Design a protein around this ligand. Structure first.
Ligand code: GDP
Ligand code: MG
Length: 186
């Protein structure tokens, strides 16, 4: 049994809490969604063993700049989240999230996670988005940002449809465990 700590950050409303509730329960939140989900644990097969991943939600607004980082000590991997239908939230992964995580946790790997993939793929939503002169974040743009912030992985997912949802957390686990292997004596 190995334990890892995963903290989820990103702009308000990109879907951090829904991501965590969907992973915890297997269902997109059916009732009231809290601002910040209480931290919880999940046991996941990994190699010949079991990883216990402890998941921490955060309040992403700038108002919480001093309270939110109190969650950061001893983190093994961060999920930096942006909505695939909000290009502004992608740019903030560079101007805000990468800078904050480098300041507090310079050695901790990051996974860049695109959320709300179902809306990116929803033809009617895309039309209405286009009426406001916005288009979805492309995978080309998301991968470019992955490199810009030196994230160890990138994935696009939907808490609503579960598309790539559990694999986003499998990606975070694999990155954390491989870093732990790299840091061990030979
Ligand atoms: N269509 C869709 N909506 C989502 C998804 N994830 C979150 N939402 C919606 O986005 C809004 C904000 O979600 P929330 O989890 O509170 O975002 P947070 O502020 O980052 O924690 C809510 O209306 C959610 O229902 C998703 O994968 N697909
Ligand atoms: Mg939330």
């Amino acid at each position: 049994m190995e334990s890892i700590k995963c903290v989820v950050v990103g702009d308000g409303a990109v879907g951090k809490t829904a991501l965590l509730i969907a992973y915890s329960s297997g269902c997109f939140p059916e009732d009231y969604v809290p601002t910040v989900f209480d931290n919880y644990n999940k046991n996941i097969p990994y190699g010949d063993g079991i990883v216990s991943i402890a998941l921490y939600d955060t309040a992403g607004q700038e108002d919480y700049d001093r309270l939110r980082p109190l969650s950061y000590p001893d983190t093994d991997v961060f999920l930096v989240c942006f909505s695939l239908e909000n290009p502004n939230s992608l740019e903030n992964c560079h101007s805000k999230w990468a800078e904050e995580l480098k300041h507090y946790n310079p050695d901790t790997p990051i996974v860049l996670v695109g959320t709300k993939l179902d809306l990116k793929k929803d033809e009617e939503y895309v039309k209405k988005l286009k009426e406001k002169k916005i288009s979805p974040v492309t995978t080309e743009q998301g991968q470019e940002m992955k490199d810009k912030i030196k994230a160890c992985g990138y994935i696009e997912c939907s808490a609503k449809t579960m598309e790539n949802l559990t694999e986003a957390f499998n990606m975070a686990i694999d990155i954390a465990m491989k870093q732990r292997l790299k840091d061990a004596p030979p």
